[PDB]
Structures are given as C-alpha cells and as structure tokens.
Amino acid sequence: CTFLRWASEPEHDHRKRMGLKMLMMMGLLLPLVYAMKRHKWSVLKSRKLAYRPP
Amino acid sequence: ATYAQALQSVPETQVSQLDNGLRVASEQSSQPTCTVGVWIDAGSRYENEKNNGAGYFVEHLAFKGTKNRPGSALEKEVESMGAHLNAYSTREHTAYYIKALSKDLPKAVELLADIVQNCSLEDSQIEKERDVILQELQENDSSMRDVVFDYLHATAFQGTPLAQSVEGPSENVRKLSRADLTEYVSQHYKAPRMVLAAAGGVEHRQLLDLAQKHFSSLSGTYVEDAVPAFTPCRFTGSEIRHRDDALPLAHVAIAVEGPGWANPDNVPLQVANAIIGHYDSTYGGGTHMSSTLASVAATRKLCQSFQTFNICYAETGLLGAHFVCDNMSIDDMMFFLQGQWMRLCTSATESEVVRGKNILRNALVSHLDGTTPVCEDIGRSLLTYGRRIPLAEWESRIAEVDASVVREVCSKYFYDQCPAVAGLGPIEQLPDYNRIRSGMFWLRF
C-alpha cells in the first residue's frame, strides 16, 4: 500500500518539503507585508477631521 | 575700490553692555537720520496656552498710554519732529523702533524708555483695544498667505509653544485682562533680554549715556524666583488640509526641519534656496529665468507665485517653499518642486552654486541699505547670534560653500525627511501625504 501511494504520488517527499518551506516563508511574509500595509495606510487611519462652517 | 575693499569699510557695530544687562549697540554713519529701537525677546514662543496673544495686546497698547506721557500726547511729540514710530512683534522677538532724525536722538531714546518701562495699560484702553485685535484677526483670516504659514506652524510644531499664533486664538483676546498683560510685561520686558539699537547719525557714546540716564531703572529681577525658560520644540512631520473650494487660488506651503539661528549649515541652505529662487507672474523673465522650477512654471503658466522661505528660530527652523497656483497645478509643482530639491540633493554643479552665491551676496548687501534695515539687523543679530556678524564674515562663509557642501547639506536636511505640508483653498489635486513623502527620496540615488 505504501508502494502504491508512492507510485501515484511520486512527489510526496518533495511536496511536503515545499509545504514546510512555504509555511515558514509566509509565516514570515504575512506579518511583514501586513506591517507595511498598516505603515502606509496609517495616515488614513489617523485622520482627525474637522468642520468649521461660518 | 573692489567689493572686498568696500566690504571692509562697513562702519562697525560697537557693542556695549549696561550694568542692567541692556546691551547698547550702535552703527555710526553720515546720514542725518537714525533708527533707534529696543529689541526684546518676547513672542509667541514664550507665551503659554492661557495667555497666548498677550504680546500682540501689549504691542497694541504700548503706544496708547505711558503714564508720564498722558496718552495721545506721545503721538503729538512723535509727530512734532516728523518721527515715525513703529512696532513689529514676531513669534520670537518684539521691537519698538523710532525712525527719526539724528538731532532728535535725546528725545527719541526717552520716548522709547517711556514705552518700554512705564506703560499705563489702562483698562478702558484695554477694552477699546480688544475690538481692534478681533477685527485684525478677521483681516488676517482674509490674508490668504498669512493663514497658510500659521497652518504650517501649527501642523509642524504641534503641541509646542512655537505652533501658537502670534496674535493668539480668538478666545484669549476676549479674556485677557490687565493682570495677564502686566505679568507678561514683568516677566518678559527685562533688561538682560533687550538690545537698544540705533543706526545712522548715531554716536555710540551718545547712545551709551542716553541709555544710562534713561534705561537705568530697568532691572533683571524675576519676582520671587519665576524665570521663563526657553523650551525646545519638536518638528512633527504632518499635514493640515483646509480645503475651501470657494477661494479662487490655492496656497500650499511645504517645509521640513532646518537649522537654528546659530548653525553654519544656514549659509549653504540659503544658497540652495537661492538656486530654486522665487517667481511671480509679473516678473518678465518668463521662460528664460535660470531657476529650473521657475522656468517650468512660467512655460506652462503653472503657478501664480512660488517663493522659498528660510524661517529659522533658535533651536529649529522651517525650510521649504510656499506656492500659490490654481487647483490643477498643485500636483505638478509638487512633482517639480520636490524634484528640484531632489536634484539639488542629488547632483549640484558649481555653476548654479556660484549663481546662488551671487544671489545671496546681493540679497545680503541690498537688504542692508537704509537706517531701519541696519537697525533691525543689529537688534536681531545681537539677540540671535549674540553679535552682529560683519558682512566680511558673511563673504567668507559664502566663499567657503561649494557644490559638495550644498549637496551634503541638502542631503542632511532634505533627503528622506518627512515634510510639514499645509494647504488652503481648492486643494484637491494636492498629492496625498504618502505621495509627498515618497517624493522626498529618489530611487536612482
């Protein structure tokens, strides 16, 4: 059964290796890209508005 | 007689110092007129939130009543000999100078002593003067250039005494009573922080004994212990946008933190600020003026008038440009003006550096003609630099600066520094603050 699983999936080892690499890579990437987004958008999210009609 | 020979002549600015601390400085010359004034360190920088605007009120009431002079009698005496008495109160200093003939010097010093010292500060005059300040507040609100600079000061030095307007918010002027003003006069109109200046047909010895015989009563005491202290201010890169589409034109002033009053980097910066230059629609140079931004603006009729300012206080100053243009030019200039800075930041050549040096030399020499500009220079320089810098020293500093100095100074001041933009009018095409900040750096350099 294990032989057949390898046979129909002759990338299992390398697929899980890529899974590990992608998981850690984007566990790094998501916080940093999100931090960049909040850094750039922070001007909008702190706009104190005002209204002074005559 | 070449420039250097004429520069040395430069009648000196002998500086004395009374025992009270009043540093009496004069500048003898040959004209039969003179300018004598007292430059006091008192402005919106020292005012607090509760009494913001007391300096303007005291300036208003200074000429009204001075006890010994009953009132309009002061005006009668001033106009008797043709003297023109004037006062200007900026954010830091405040001066009351008499523009009069040389012979009337003994009386002029006495009149200045009467104003700065014995001021009646009558309550009825306070009530009458209260309306005038409020009216002047509305006139300033109509002043479409003054309000943008006030906005720049508010947004840049936010939370600091510097952001406080000189006139004061239109709430303190409706509550400032005699007690607040008298405290302001007592705590700020002190002899050590005063310079008695006079330029023209003024004998330094004569000014000295006139001050001794008149300004002796001034003391350096500070009541029990209360001593006002200069509080350093912080430059906060921000943006304020008062979009009023009904206004015909759009004012935008963009500035970054620059140098202080006493800092050598001031000299190169003005040179750079000379390279960008200034332009108004009624110039005539048009598409030929050497300033790249000015030529670009004139070619497409981009703006109506752009100027570069070098507002410089004690510990920090504002360095940048204020431009007035229609609604659909704010973006373009914001791309061009910044780019000009970037070019001056990135690659400056000795040719335009020499041009800026000549422009700065001409500005310094031409600004210093007539008695009142010389008197103002003495009064401001003694308070700011601690001495009047002679024009020869200015020549030396301007000769020292070259393209490398300008590039490094602009890089240290302009490159990748958050600006303090402030707009007024139909400001809609004005790029978002992140666009302006991104323009502060060049992805090629």
Automatic annotation (TrEMBL), chain A:
It is found in: Mitochondrion inner membrane. Component of the ubiquinol-cytochrome c oxidoreductase (cytochrome b-c1 complex, complex III, CIII), a multisubunit enzyme composed of 11 subunits. The complex is composed of 3 respiratory subunits cytochrome b, cytochrome c1 and Rieske protein UQCRFS1, 2 core protein subunits UQCRC1/QCR1 and UQCRC2/QCR2, and 6 low-molecular weight protein subunits UQCRH/QCR6, UQCRB/QCR7, UQCRQ/QCR8, UQCR10/QCR9, UQCR11/QCR10 and subunit 9, the cleavage product of Rieske protein UQCRFS1. Belongs to the cytochrome c family. This is Cytochrome c1, heme protein, mitochondrial. The chain holds residues 272 to 325 of 326 of the full protein.
From TrEMBL, chain B:
It is a peripheral membrane protein. This is Cytochrome b-c1 complex subunit 1, mitochondrial. Gene3D superfamilies: Metalloenzyme, LuxS/M16 peptidase-like. The keyword Transit peptide applies. GO terms for molecular function: metal ion binding. InterPro entries: Metalloenz_LuxS/M16, MPP/UQCRC_Complex, Pept_M16_N, Peptidase_M16_C. It is found in: Mitochondrion inner membrane. Belongs to the peptidase M16 family. UQCRC1/QCR1 subfamily. Residues 23-169 form the Peptidase M16 N-terminal domain. SUPFAM superfamilies: LuxS/MPP-like metallohydrolase. The keyword Transmembrane does not apply. GO terms for cellular component: mitochondrial inner membrane; protein-containing complex. It holds the Pfam family Peptidase_M16. Residues 175-360 form the Peptidase M16 C-terminal domain. Component of the ubiquinol-cytochrome c oxidoreductase (cytochrome b-c1 complex, complex III, CIII), a multisubunit enzyme composed of 11 subunits. The complex is composed of 3 respiratory subunits cytochrome b, cytochrome c1 and Rieske protein UQCRFS1, 2 core protein subunits UQCRC1/QCR1 and UQCRC2/QCR2, and 6 low-molecular weight protein subunits UQCRH/QCR6, UQCRB/QCR7, UQCRQ/QCR8, UQCR10/QCR9, UQCR11/QCR10 and subunit 9, the cleavage product of Rieske protein UQCRFS1. Keywords: Acetylation, Electron transport, Membrane, Mitochondrion, Mitochondrion inner membrane, Phosphoprotein, Respiratory chain, Transit peptide, Transport.
